[PDB]
Amino acid sequence: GQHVTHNEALDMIDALAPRVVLSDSLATPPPAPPDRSAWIVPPGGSGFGGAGPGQIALRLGGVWHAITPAQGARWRVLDRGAAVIWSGTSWRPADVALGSTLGLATIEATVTATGPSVTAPALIPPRAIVLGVTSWTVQAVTGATSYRVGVPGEPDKFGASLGAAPGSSNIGVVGPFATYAPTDVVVTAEGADFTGGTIGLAASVILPGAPV
Amino acid sequence: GQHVTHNEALDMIDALAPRVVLSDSLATPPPAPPDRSAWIVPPGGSGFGGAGPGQIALRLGGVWHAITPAQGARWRVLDRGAAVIWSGTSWRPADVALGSTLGLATIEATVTATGPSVTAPALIPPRAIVLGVTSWTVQAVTGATSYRVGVPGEPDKFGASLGAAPGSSNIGVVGPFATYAPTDVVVTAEGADFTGGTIGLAASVILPGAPV
Amino acid sequence: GQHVTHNEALDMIDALAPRVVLSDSLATPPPAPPDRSAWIVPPGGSGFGGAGPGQIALRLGGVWHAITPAQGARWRVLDRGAAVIWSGTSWRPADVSLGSTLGLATIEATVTATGPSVTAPALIPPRAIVLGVTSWTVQAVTGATSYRVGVPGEPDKFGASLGAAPGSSNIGVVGPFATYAPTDVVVTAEGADFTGGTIGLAASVILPGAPV
Amino acid sequence: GFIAAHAEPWPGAMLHSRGSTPEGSFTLAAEADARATIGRTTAALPPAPAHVWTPGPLVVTLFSGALVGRPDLDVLDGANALAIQHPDGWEVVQFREATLTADRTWRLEGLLRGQRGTDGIVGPAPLPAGAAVVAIDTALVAAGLSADDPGRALWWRSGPDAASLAAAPLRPHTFTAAGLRAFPPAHLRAVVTGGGDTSLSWVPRSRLVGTTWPDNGAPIPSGEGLERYQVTIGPTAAPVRVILADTPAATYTAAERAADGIAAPFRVAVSQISETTGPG
Amino acid sequence: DGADVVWEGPENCNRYSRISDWSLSMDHLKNTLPAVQTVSLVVAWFGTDLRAGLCRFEPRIELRAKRTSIEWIAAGLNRGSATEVSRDENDRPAFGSSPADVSVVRAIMDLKARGFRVVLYPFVMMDVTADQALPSPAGTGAQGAYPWRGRIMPDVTGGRVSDQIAALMGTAQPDDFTAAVTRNKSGEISQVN
């Protein structure tokens, strides 16, 4: 209650918890930042910034809190768009984007393996790089010697010969080439009958499609 | 407070926050792990960190408190360099490392478009991987049907047929290939007048293999 | 205190701290959202914890109060495995990372640079994506201009010129080419003598389909 | 000693007369207005975490009356509290609300435990499938007992005024409310130290005052007289080292561990033995 | 049935006073009638069909539940054991059960010393239900909603009329029924099993 105010706690949580900072890389913090807004003071930061350079100054109704950044806490810069984590020692800009935040579409395509071939429904999102098209075998595939994952019309695009064995997470890795243009996935039996099996898929497709 | 110290809360704050954990996979935790840093006990760890091996021993005041990881608990493993998210069942590593940090410099710019051919000034930094080229249209481009955004002399590198229209987002990947080499992205037009229009142009700028 | 129980405070702290939360995008949330856990409410979300579409429905003590999302706090989406940081207006999507983790197991080797060139001991396993390979200069190379850390048979393929200077972390990145296929990196001095210096190399190993 | 009476469709005063003698020389000790609201548990529940609402679905068929679903704030100042029949102290839960599932059945939800050691009875024993849950009410009668009476199984006539002896059930019964003092386990902050010096700090937790948290400079007081908090050794059910300490701090020694067997991270359960009474 | 048992519903009592109507009725009768030789304890014994031999004279309870501290075992049939014969209308006859063995002894005891000369009247009323045909002693020999006492005849066979009569009677012995008389704390009969 009076001894520990709710506000003290609320501010503490907001400031300490990872926040996307709005730092503009200026020597001085903006005169009127938003309430509960984190601004990391850049090195060689003049003017205000009660927090030392390399420390986050968080506006709280005009009170800039000199909070030493928490270890392992992301402090993405709004202006930069860069994810600058604090390691407890130094600022590190982690993997990132420039108005094109990359989202890896986790697409799970489950297709019963039937007849000779089936087409997986995991269409690539338009303009999305594919890191890897992993294929799992949900259920043992009768007849088929191996999976033949690929884009329709080609069973050899990635993981040309995979595993039809039960519970096998064989990876059809696109690898160096990534198909940004939207495309479906086709699965075929390897010189055999697909029926009697179930196919699981782990399409990982990173799209730089979101403004930041 | 007195019953629950601010320090108890502060220790909790470090634990609650995602942390750069160190998975050194030592059966016995090191005598002096960094304070306010979690050294994750490997599963099967002996001696110290005995409670819940596979939990994270966080050193606060010389006492290693093994935090029980929850669903989607993300702890960046320093030794691996991967950010490993404990799904809840077990550790699950995120897609990526070597101390490599992907530096980002914001280059979003509004390119006023005058004439069919306009030159974007967003030259890539040397040795900076371009995940994708970000395209937006800020103002109505008059008489415009297509955006030949791409390297000068080769507008085809990024889509050259992207529709040119007011407020049109043509955000996209420049193929599987990433352009480390510095390059402009001239906004040419396919017989499209660009006058009276503005283009929001950015290229994801990633500097991989850059030390913390 | 009497006014706020330690537990009341604890629940508030857990909720405010960024929590990975599952967005199944249903009109109605799962029947038992766990305590200190929430189901993301999509816009148009209704029912229990339907207060505010675009909020998060969290059940504590049988009341599914919907927490107001805090900007800068990452309410990552467990259900789609999509990182989602609240933008304050929308569930902005951050970089996303399967049911098949793309695990990182960097291989660290410290070959002493010797003779003119030493193939790096660090080895890329089959199906391991290489974001990049580090070339830390542990000791001053004698007569060696650069660390040509390259895919075997092609030092120039990536990181062709990284200055071989003492105390320099020459991380080199294979950005356009993700070499899932196994490669033993070859490090060569640039038309120079490697002897007298030490190279610290971590080779990024990313394995799709890794178990959790 | 509380004696709420579930009259079976009975209109009138209920006379509760207590006679120590088995034969039944009862002397009037209490009177009950009418059938009290009572409930019968139909479910078994593991102990809820202390001081946090837990939405266990506790289905209770109300013997008499109906339960009320209410805002948590009212329960915070004390409203929805029902005392289930329990080993030792009857366990009373300040659940935020109860949800009707059937005409008599109400599902208590957001159960709150650990208030005045409400959780203390539950931790040793999880609630049984069937128990008598009684709402706090005017009908509940606790007065008329001499100090000597607790600890003695005085036969209690417990029935309507007209009914007597066999007709108003006469049951030998004893009450231990004073014994229930210091029900919350003393806050335990055992600190293992080199030489196996585990200091089992035992901040006093007082049942009668309640589990007060210092608020605006109002720290938890006593009111349970003196309590010797006890440490239960983790390796053995009977503590190898039996220490009941009035002092909260109880630093351990290497010699005890050497002489017998004491684990370094040994689990300690606070048995709330009281100087004033017995374990509480 | 219902919930936990509620000790209400005094049997043989419809009085506001709640004391049993039995004995209270005797008080009124005694006052009105000087002679006091009206004892006719006609049992509500249960019988089934109107054809002799086929009919069996076995009593049944008023209601299947209606649990009471007192229990009744006429002809070896317990309150739990038998079926209801006193259902409250709605197409089910409210015949009424045979009185408890304890009640019979108690009745004799109350009648004694009240100036009432006690004479026991064995009465069996057959109340088989409807849904068959027309109740008949012989000829059709069918059964009906109400069978009058003494209207039973054996029509299966002339040779077997004796056998049918024997079947209807049974072959009782005093030893065949064992009386587990129980006395309460007062010592008056509590349960005559």
PDB file of all heavy atoms in Angstrom, chain C residues 69-93, unseen atoms left out:
ATOM      1  N   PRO C  69      -2.704  -4.985 -23.543  1.00  0.00           N
ATOM      2  CA  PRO C  69      -1.348  -5.287 -23.983  1.00  0.00           C
ATOM      3  C   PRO C  69      -0.482  -4.049 -23.842  1.00  0.00           C
ATOM      4  O   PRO C  69      -0.946  -2.938 -24.099  1.00  0.00           O
ATOM      5  N   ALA C  70       0.767  -4.233 -23.444  1.00  0.00           N
ATOM      6  CA  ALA C  70       1.656  -3.101 -23.260  1.00  0.00           C
ATOM      7  C   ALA C  70       2.603  -3.026 -24.440  1.00  0.00           C
ATOM      8  O   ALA C  70       3.224  -4.022 -24.808  1.00  0.00           O
ATOM      9  N   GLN C  71       2.699  -1.850 -25.052  1.00  0.00           N
ATOM     10  CA  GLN C  71       3.580  -1.682 -26.199  1.00  0.00           C
ATOM     11  C   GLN C  71       5.018  -1.913 -25.774  1.00  0.00           C
ATOM     12  O   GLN C  71       5.438  -1.461 -24.708  1.00  0.00           O
ATOM     13  N   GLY C  72       5.778  -2.614 -26.602  1.00  0.00           N
ATOM     14  CA  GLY C  72       7.166  -2.888 -26.286  1.00  0.00           C
ATOM     15  C   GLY C  72       7.335  -4.169 -25.506  1.00  0.00           C
ATOM     16  O   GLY C  72       8.447  -4.662 -25.356  1.00  0.00           O
ATOM     17  N   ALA C  73       6.232  -4.760 -25.066  1.00  0.00           N
ATOM     18  CA  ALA C  73       6.314  -6.034 -24.375  1.00  0.00           C
ATOM     19  C   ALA C  73       5.968  -7.074 -25.413  1.00  0.00           C
ATOM     20  O   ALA C  73       4.950  -6.957 -26.095  1.00  0.00           O
ATOM     21  N   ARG C  74       6.804  -8.095 -25.551  1.00  0.00           N
ATOM     22  CA  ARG C  74       6.572  -9.059 -26.614  1.00  0.00           C
ATOM     23  C   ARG C  74       5.628 -10.154 -26.200  1.00  0.00           C
ATOM     24  O   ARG C  74       5.996 -11.066 -25.455  1.00  0.00           O
ATOM     25  N   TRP C  75       4.394 -10.064 -26.666  1.00  0.00           N
ATOM     26  CA  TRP C  75       3.452 -11.127 -26.403  1.00  0.00           C
ATOM     27  C   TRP C  75       3.607 -12.080 -27.568  1.00  0.00           C
ATOM     28  O   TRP C  75       2.759 -12.116 -28.455  1.00  0.00           O
ATOM     29  N   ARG C  76       4.682 -12.858 -27.575  1.00  0.00           N
ATOM     30  CA  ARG C  76       4.959 -13.739 -28.704  1.00  0.00           C
ATOM     31  C   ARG C  76       3.861 -14.767 -28.866  1.00  0.00           C
ATOM     32  O   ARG C  76       3.338 -15.265 -27.878  1.00  0.00           O
ATOM     33  N   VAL C  77       3.504 -15.092 -30.105  1.00  0.00           N
ATOM     34  CA  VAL C  77       2.396 -16.016 -30.330  1.00  0.00           C
ATOM     35  C   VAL C  77       2.865 -17.456 -30.303  1.00  0.00           C
ATOM     36  O   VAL C  77       3.518 -17.920 -31.229  1.00  0.00           O
ATOM     37  N   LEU C  78       2.543 -18.164 -29.227  1.00  0.00           N
ATOM     38  CA  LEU C  78       2.912 -19.572 -29.132  1.00  0.00           C
ATOM     39  C   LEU C  78       2.203 -20.417 -30.173  1.00  0.00           C
ATOM     40  O   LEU C  78       2.814 -21.296 -30.780  1.00  0.00           O
ATOM     41  N   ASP C  79       0.926 -20.140 -30.417  1.00  0.00           N
ATOM     42  CA  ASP C  79       0.153 -20.988 -31.322  1.00  0.00           C
ATOM     43  C   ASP C  79       0.689 -21.032 -32.740  1.00  0.00           C
ATOM     44  O   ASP C  79       0.723 -22.098 -33.344  1.00  0.00           O
ATOM     45  N   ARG C  80       1.057 -19.887 -33.300  1.00  0.00           N
ATOM     46  CA  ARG C  80       1.640 -19.878 -34.635  1.00  0.00           C
ATOM     47  C   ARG C  80       3.141 -19.815 -34.522  1.00  0.00           C
ATOM     48  O   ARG C  80       3.846 -19.773 -35.528  1.00  0.00           O
ATOM     49  N   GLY C  81       3.637 -19.795 -33.293  1.00  0.00           N
ATOM     50  CA  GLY C  81       5.066 -19.682 -33.091  1.00  0.00           C
ATOM     51  C   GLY C  81       5.556 -18.416 -33.757  1.00  0.00           C
ATOM     52  O   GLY C  81       6.637 -18.385 -34.326  1.00  0.00           O
ATOM     53  N   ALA C  82       4.754 -17.363 -33.698  1.00  0.00           N
ATOM     54  CA  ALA C  82       5.140 -16.124 -34.343  1.00  0.00           C
ATOM     55  C   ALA C  82       5.431 -15.085 -33.289  1.00  0.00           C
ATOM     56  O   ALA C  82       4.580 -14.781 -32.464  1.00  0.00           O
ATOM     57  N   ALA C  83       6.627 -14.515 -33.315  1.00  0.00           N
ATOM     58  CA  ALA C  83       6.898 -13.461 -32.365  1.00  0.00           C
ATOM     59  C   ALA C  83       5.979 -12.320 -32.709  1.00  0.00           C
ATOM     60  O   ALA C  83       5.892 -11.911 -33.866  1.00  0.00           O
ATOM     61  N   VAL C  84       5.285 -11.804 -31.707  1.00  0.00           N
ATOM     62  CA  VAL C  84       4.400 -10.678 -31.933  1.00  0.00           C
ATOM     63  C   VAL C  84       4.568  -9.660 -30.821  1.00  0.00           C
ATOM     64  O   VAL C  84       4.223  -9.917 -29.668  1.00  0.00           O
ATOM     65  N   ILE C  85       5.119  -8.504 -31.161  1.00  0.00           N
ATOM     66  CA  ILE C  85       5.279  -7.465 -30.159  1.00  0.00           C
ATOM     67  C   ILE C  85       4.143  -6.486 -30.371  1.00  0.00           C
ATOM     68  O   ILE C  85       3.885  -6.067 -31.495  1.00  0.00           O
ATOM     69  N   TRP C  86       3.453  -6.128 -29.296  1.00  0.00           N
ATOM     70  CA  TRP C  86       2.349  -5.197 -29.415  1.00  0.00           C
ATOM     71  C   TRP C  86       2.909  -3.877 -29.918  1.00  0.00           C
ATOM     72  O   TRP C  86       3.890  -3.367 -29.377  1.00  0.00           O
ATOM     73  N   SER C  87       2.289  -3.316 -30.950  1.00  0.00           N
ATOM     74  CA  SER C  87       2.746  -2.043 -31.497  1.00  0.00           C
ATOM     75  C   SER C  87       1.987  -0.924 -30.827  1.00  0.00           C
ATOM     76  O   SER C  87       2.262   0.250 -31.067  1.00  0.00           O
ATOM     77  N   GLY C  88       1.030  -1.282 -29.984  1.00  0.00           N
ATOM     78  CA  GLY C  88       0.207  -0.293 -29.313  1.00  0.00           C
ATOM     79  C   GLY C  88      -1.073  -0.085 -30.088  1.00  0.00           C
ATOM     80  O   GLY C  88      -2.047   0.433 -29.545  1.00  0.00           O
ATOM     81  N   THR C  89      -1.091  -0.497 -31.351  1.00  0.00           N
ATOM     82  CA  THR C  89      -2.311  -0.411 -32.142  1.00  0.00           C
ATOM     83  C   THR C  89      -2.632  -1.758 -32.748  1.00  0.00           C
ATOM     84  O   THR C  89      -3.798  -2.088 -32.963  1.00  0.00           O
ATOM     85  N   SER C  90      -1.599  -2.544 -33.020  1.00  0.00           N
ATOM     86  CA  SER C  90      -1.801  -3.826 -33.674  1.00  0.00           C
ATOM     87  C   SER C  90      -0.835  -4.842 -33.122  1.00  0.00           C
ATOM     88  O   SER C  90       0.158  -4.483 -32.495  1.00  0.00           O
ATOM     89  N   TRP C  91      -1.136  -6.113 -33.346  1.00  0.00           N
ATOM     90  CA  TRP C  91      -0.227  -7.160 -32.924  1.00  0.00           C
ATOM     91  C   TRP C  91       0.871  -7.216 -33.960  1.00  0.00           C
ATOM     92  O   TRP C  91       0.869  -8.089 -34.827  1.00  0.00           O
ATOM     93  N   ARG C  92       1.810  -6.283 -33.880  1.00  0.00           N
ATOM     94  CA  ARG C  92       2.873  -6.232 -34.868  1.00  0.00           C
ATOM     95  C   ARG C  92       3.680  -7.517 -34.808  1.00  0.00           C
ATOM     96  O   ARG C  92       3.998  -8.005 -33.727  1.00  0.00           O
ATOM     97  N   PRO C  93       4.021  -8.068 -35.980  1.00  0.00           N
ATOM     98  CA  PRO C  93       4.774  -9.320 -36.003  1.00  0.00           C
ATOM     99  C   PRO C  93       6.273  -9.080 -36.026  1.00  0.00           C
ATOM    100  O   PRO C  93       6.776  -8.433 -36.942  1.00  0.00           O
TER     101      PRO C  93
END
